Amino acid sequence: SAVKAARYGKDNVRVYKVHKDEKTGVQTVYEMTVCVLLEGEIETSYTKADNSVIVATDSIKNTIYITAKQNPVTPPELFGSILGTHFIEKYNHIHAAHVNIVCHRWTRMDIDGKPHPHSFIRDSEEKRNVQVDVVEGKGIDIKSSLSGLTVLKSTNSQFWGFLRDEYTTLKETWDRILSTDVDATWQWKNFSGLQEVRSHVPKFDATWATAREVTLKTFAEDNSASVQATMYKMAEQILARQQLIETVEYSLPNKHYFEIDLSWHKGLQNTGKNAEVFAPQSDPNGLIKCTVGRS
Amino acid sequence: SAVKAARYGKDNVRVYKVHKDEKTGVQTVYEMTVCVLLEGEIETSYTKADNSVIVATDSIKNTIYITAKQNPVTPPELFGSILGTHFIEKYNHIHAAHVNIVCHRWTRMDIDGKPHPHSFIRDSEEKRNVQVDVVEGKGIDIKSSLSGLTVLKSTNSQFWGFLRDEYTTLKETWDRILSTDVDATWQWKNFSGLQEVRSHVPKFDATWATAREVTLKTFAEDNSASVQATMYKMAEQILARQQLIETVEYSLPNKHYFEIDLSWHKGLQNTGKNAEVFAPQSDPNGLIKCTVGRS
Amino acid sequence: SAVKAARYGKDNVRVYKVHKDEKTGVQTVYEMTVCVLLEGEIETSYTKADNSVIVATDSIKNTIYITAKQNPVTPPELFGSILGTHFIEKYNHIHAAHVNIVCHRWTRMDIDGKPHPHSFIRDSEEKRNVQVDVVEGKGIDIKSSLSGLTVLKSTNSQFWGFLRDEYTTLKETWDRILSTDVDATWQWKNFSGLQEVRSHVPKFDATWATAREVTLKTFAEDNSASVQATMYKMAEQILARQQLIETVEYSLPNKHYFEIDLSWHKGLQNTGKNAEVFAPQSDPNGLIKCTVGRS
Amino acid sequence: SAVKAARYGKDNVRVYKVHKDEKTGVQTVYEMTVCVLLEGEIETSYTKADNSVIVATDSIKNTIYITAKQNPVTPPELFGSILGTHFIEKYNHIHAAHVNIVCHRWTRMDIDGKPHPHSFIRDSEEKRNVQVDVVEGKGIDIKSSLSGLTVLKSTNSQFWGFLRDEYTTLKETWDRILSTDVDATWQWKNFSGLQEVRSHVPKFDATWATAREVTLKTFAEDNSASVQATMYKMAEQILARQQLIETVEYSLPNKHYFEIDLSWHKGLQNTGKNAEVFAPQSDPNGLIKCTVGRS
Ligand SMILES: O=c1[nH]c(=O)c2nn[nH]c2[nH]1
Ligand SMILES: O=c1[nH]c(=O)c2nn[nH]c2[nH]1
Ligand SMILES: O=c1[nH]c(=O)c2nn[nH]c2[nH]1
Ligand SMILES: O=c1[nH]c(=O)c2nn[nH]c2[nH]1
Ligand code: NA
Ligand code: NA
Ligand code: NA
Ligand code: NA
């Protein structure tokens, strides 16, 4: 037998950092969960019990805190690139670092219509994430994403003209509820190293904001022919607005809301044009994915 | 042996309702999870296999949908009271109904600074809840609550002067992070029946909004001596602003963020006044509760 | 305003303890999650910012570890009583301690048909729990429970003869699937203090085992007329077998498995006597509760 | 822009099936959660709103139930292959089906030391899973796995001789607790189609059982030098025992249990050889992965 692939490291490292503006008194907080996995010339730790090649996962944890102390933690694309580069430069036998970061929302509170200097609220479980793969001699690959954005529209969604055969019971519809949890990922062109990532720093926050905006606007405004058709429109616009993105991927559950026929009870009308009360279905759900790139 | 207490019904009934304004085209959605448990002269179903006394839980489910079809579902205090009253009036042998409702947020989207007529976002997992107990001959008891409101302040929290003995290792502090998930419940004076609940309908939404506002403002502005002291201030203000509330209960986890000593690494300073990077602790957590009533 | 009720302490304190038999080499592990909440003359911490009355929750955490170091942690009824008694005896102004313990399963592994001295498996998420309330001058009240026991029987469950009215669509049945998650609690007669709890130590493990056995046997063997009727039979037997129990409470979800009509597809027969494939329903669910005491 | 990749289908389809032996009266139940995603010539549904190419996800759901009605559902490797083959044969424009199945445990109850004919218990959340990719013209690729197997050993684990530098605080140890949740996957040699899968049917259950046994025995018996070294030993043995497996992958969290120094309290000794009470850590955790193949 032989080791075909191996990676190891520390997962679920929670980190909080505060920045204090001495002049204005304003404080800004960041909270993240970080995972770092390393690859390299570490096969002998598996095959020969040779621990000499192992950077202990506890040391990886220490490194994450130290790096957060000495560097900005925002945008996460930059922080992940600094962290990943550290491991490949510090350790001769480590040749790839894989860094995943989940950013948690802490939104500044407005009290009496003014921004509070040091109080924050978690407005939604929506996350901003990055995956950074730093590979010695091959640069830095970054995938940025948003996840956990849950939306619903109560009309202006249709689904008709699909294939009908002996397995089909679904009725065509010209007016339905559409609800989904959005997972969207944009993959950046490969960067040669940290200098190049630094040169593009302003684009990261801007592109995240654009991706969010395009997602929300398109969902709200499209008279949707299907999840497939609406999601393609989203991806198209993101690629148009940021030339440094190579591909956009969306993965969308279709969370069903079923009509409830109440006609058995005193002829109560609650279907089609008369539908007011629906039963949200926890499962099963549609799952629709697409990866869109450039011509 | 004897049956000392019994209740039964249907839990986790998910309901969505849409209202369509024909004039303006504007649609408004409500989504809830409902539990209804009944009590009454039902002992023989347990002791003698006498199912004749059982209103099937499937029928309870049907009733929830039918009631939502025929009545407003907001404020939840009113809907729960209608639903509970139904069971005690319809069934001679049923003498109490216990209705729990969890309201899920669907917030209207703003697209280009204008409210969208039919698109919604789940902004946070914060819930608005009610517990309604309708007891034949004893009226309607309503407890309203908000839960899942997660906040953090990065300074202006202290904790010193606590009891110190041979079990104590905690250092006194004059500057710490305070973060919690807020669970707040206000209990209404007993209502004589549905007519009285209807007469107070405008107070329900107003009091929920007030409770939320007081919670957020007090948390942000109090130079907190302890969780205990800050939560008492909140409860005091709510009771002052709504005479029809008898008691306010808060239950607050104290979610710890620990300093990380980095001095072992190149004398790096990251404690006390130099603390910038902290380790959020998933567990254990403080849990602090108080029920405040009128003198 | 006045403080009507208050309690505070530490939740989610995870504890592991190992016992090593020097003679035999055999090791036995225990893992628990503990919550301790205190009550007493602590109102001024809420109303006057007087921290002098507060035993810090961090100290409560220390106390739990110290108590586990110096005492047996099994049965949990004894450990909880020791822990609760500690607080009311040590602190003059603390008059009640509320201790909740969840015991996690670590079952010794059998390797080649022999018990391994030091390796364990988590066989199921079933828990054994206790709630111990130690109140100065009123003794020790203990509720023991098992939870998270999930069972299913594929036949020998019926449900017919229930009330039918204009809200009813449910068909009567003489053969259905019954599946539930069992939550069973037995409440001990009040104990005068720790000496009395110690005198009954062997009964705790025995009664837990009996409750589990009675639950499983009755469920498997009863030709069930309803969840209500079957659960009553369980509670009856437990009360018969342990005179020191005052009441038994069961809380049982009825997790539905629906027939799927496939006759639309090539006349496929999959209902009634021909039912083979079913759709488990995640929600809604029946919820059936009973508390049984002595005549 | 262009569609680079696309797949869509139905997730979280819960299925139960019962087999009734008429002769013996014995019933056997199977419960699974299934996901089916399709690929093929479906780009126009995204780019041109052409629904004519879409097999509705609701139809996919129907197909899963119909296929379960007409075929055995065990072993899951066979069922997944039948289901995936169906879609590529039935629909000309569908060229790949991806089927994921999670099997839930329903273990027959023993009542009074005899197997019950129709009553079952969920003993643990351990799962048996399969991923089946059926690609037109390229055969059937099957990955089988077990997941959610949680184990702990209280001694006979060491970790010393790792790299020490200015980022390292971890002390070397010759005796520690090792606990993990096991995720193990074995990938079968490619099969040419359903006939070949059928010819190997007895190997699927046997190999699952072997993988489980090897995992448990090796964990219990290895005087472990590291997670890396122990997991390699497991993978080696599985590959030796089943020639039709090409690779074995393990992914193992290292769930830490920390010593608690209690010496500050009355010189209490609870570290090193005196360690009895430990604090399980919910996060962070080590994460160690390896893929082992043949020379
Ligand atoms: O078994 C281990 N492997 C590792 O890589 C490691 N790192 N810290 N502790 C550890 N234990
Ligand atoms: O056992 C049952 N008890 C009930 O109360 C009920 N209601 N619907 N189905 C049911 N099954
Ligand atoms: O606000 C606090 N209240 C408490 O009771 C406590 N105990 N430890 N830390 C604490 N902080
Ligand atoms: O938007 C949809 N896309 C689909 O592929 C589908 N299948 N059923 N319903 C559906 N809705
Ligand atoms: Na390197
Ligand atoms: Na009545
Ligand atoms: Na006392
Ligand atoms: Na095909």
Domains and CATH numbers, chain D: 1-295 (3.10.270.10)
| H or E segment and range at residue D66 | helix D57-70
Shortest CA gap A65–chain B (Å): 7
Q: Is A45 in the pocket of ligand 1 (CB under 6 A)?
A: no
Which DSSP category does D163 fall into? B
Cα A15 to Cα A65, A67, B168: the distances in Å are 7, 11, 27
In the block, tokens 């007993």 appear at B190
Residues in chain A: 295
Of all atoms in ligand 3, which is nearest to the CA of residue B157?
Answer: 1
Cα C6 to Cα B291, C97, D165: the distances in Å are 6, 12, 50
In the block, tokens 């003059």 appear at C92
The span from the CA of C294 to the CA of C292, in Å, is 7
Q: Is C50 in the pocket of ligand 3 (CB under 6 A)?
A: no
Q: Around Cβ A33, how many Cβ atoms within 10 Å?
A: 19
**Residues 107-166 (D) with a CB less than 8 A from some CB of C:** 109, 111-112, 116, 118-125, 149-156
Phi-psi group of D246: left, alpha or beta (phi > 0 → left; psi -120 to 50 → alpha; rest → beta): alpha
Cβ pair B96, B136 in contact under 8 A: yes
Experimental approach was: X-ray
The span from the CA of D98 to the CA of D88, in Å, is 11
Among B287, B291, B294, B295, most C C-beta atoms within 10 A, so best to mutate, is B287
Shortest CA gap A20–chain D (Å): 27
Beta-bridged to residue C147, according to DSSP, are C127
Closest by Cα among A4, A3, A94, C113 to D233: A3
The span from the CA of A129 to the CA of A147, in Å, is 8
In order, the DSSP letters of B123-135 are --S-EEEEEEEEE
Which DSSP category does A161 fall into? S
Burial category of C6 from C-beta neighbours within 10 Å (exposed 0-12, middle 13-18, buried 19 and up): buried
**Residues 187-216 (C) with a CB less than 8 A from some CB of D:** 216
Tell me the backbone φ, ψ of residue B267, rounded to 5 degrees. 60, 30
Q: Give me the helix-helix angle, C76-90 and C201-221, nearest 10°.
A: 140
Among C17, C18, C58, C104, most D C-beta atoms within 10 A, so best to mutate, is C18
Q: Is C57 in the pocket of ligand 3 (CB under 6 A)?
A: yes
| Cα maximum dimension of chain D | 78
Among C169, C266, C283, whose Cβ lies nearest the Cβ of A282? C283
Which residue in chain C has the smallest CA separation from D281? C14
Cβ pair C169, B58 in contact under 8 A: yes
What separation in Å is there between the alpha carbon of B10 and the centre of ligand 2?
Answer: 9
Collect all residues with Cβ–Cβ distance below 8 Å to C243 and sequence separation of at least 6.
none
Contact of D244 with chain A, judged by CB distance below 8 Å, is answered with no
Among C8, C50, C61, whose Cβ lies nearest the Cβ of B289? C8
The span from the CA of D118 to the CA of C212, in Å, is 19
The span from the CA of D78 to the CA of D94, in Å, is 20
**Set of chain C residues whose Cβ sits within 8 Å of the Cβ of A169:** 264
Q: Around Cβ A41, how many Cβ atoms within 10 Å?
A: 12
The span from the CA of D185 to the CA of D131, in Å, is 10
CB contact under 8 A, D47 and A232: yes
Concerning whether A265 is annotated as a catalytic residue, the answer is no
Shortest CA gap A135–chain C (Å): 38
C-alpha torsion angle, residues B109, B110, B112, B113 (rounded to 10):
180
Of D36, D52, D54, D63, the residue with max ligand 4 atoms within 8 A of its CB, to mutate for a pocket test, comes to: D54
Which DSSP category does C205 fall into? H
Closest by Cα among B207, B167, B201, B172 to B187: B207
What separation in Å is there between the alpha carbon of D86 and the centre of ligand 8?
Answer: 9
* Cited resolution, angstroms: 1.8
Which residue in chain C has the smallest CA separation from A266? C166
Which DSSP category does C224 fall into? B
Residue C271 one-letter amino acid: T
Q: Is D286 in the pocket of ligand 1 (CB under 6 A)?
A: yes
Collect all residues with Cβ–Cβ distance below 8 Å to B23 and sequence separation of at least 6.
none
The span from the CA of A146 to the CA of A81, in Å, is 18
Contact of B106 with chain A, judged by CB distance below 8 Å, is answered with yes
The span from the CA of D241 to the CA of C272, in Å, is 45
Ligand number nearest CA of C62 is: 3
CB contact under 8 A, B154 and A120: yes
**Set of chain D residues whose Cβ sits within 8 Å of the Cβ of C110:** none
Q: What would the two tokens of residue D25 be?
A: 């009266």
Cβ pair D84, D78 in contact under 8 A: no
Which one of the listed residues A33, A44, A57, A247 is annotated catalytic? A57
Concerning whether D256 is annotated as a catalytic residue, the answer is yes
Burial category of B125 from C-beta neighbours within 10 Å (exposed 0-12, middle 13-18, buried 19 and up): middle
Among B69, B150, B270, whose Cβ lies nearest the Cβ of A277? B69
**Residue C176 among known ligand-binding residues:** yes
Q: What is the distance between the terminal CA atoms of chain C, rounded to a whole angstrom?
A: 43
- Strand A127-135 vs strand A139-153: parallel, antiparallel, or unpaired? antiparallel
Q: Give me the helix-helix angle, D201-221 and D227-241, nearest 10°.
A: 150
The span from the CA of D133 to the CA of D80, in Å, is 9
Contact of D90 with chain C, judged by CB distance below 8 Å, is answered with no
Concerning whether A57 is annotated as a catalytic residue, the answer is yes
Tell me which chains share at least 3 CB pairs under 8 Å with chain C. Answer: A, B, D
| H or E segment and range at residue D250 | strand D245-254
Closest by Cα among C295, C127, C104, C290 to C208: C127
- In angstroms, how far is CA D34 from the centroid of its own chain? 14
Cβ pair D103, D128 in contact under 8 A: yes
Q: Note the helical H segments in A71-192.
A: 76-90
Instruction: Please tell me whether residue D168 adopts helix, strand or coil conformation.
Output: coil
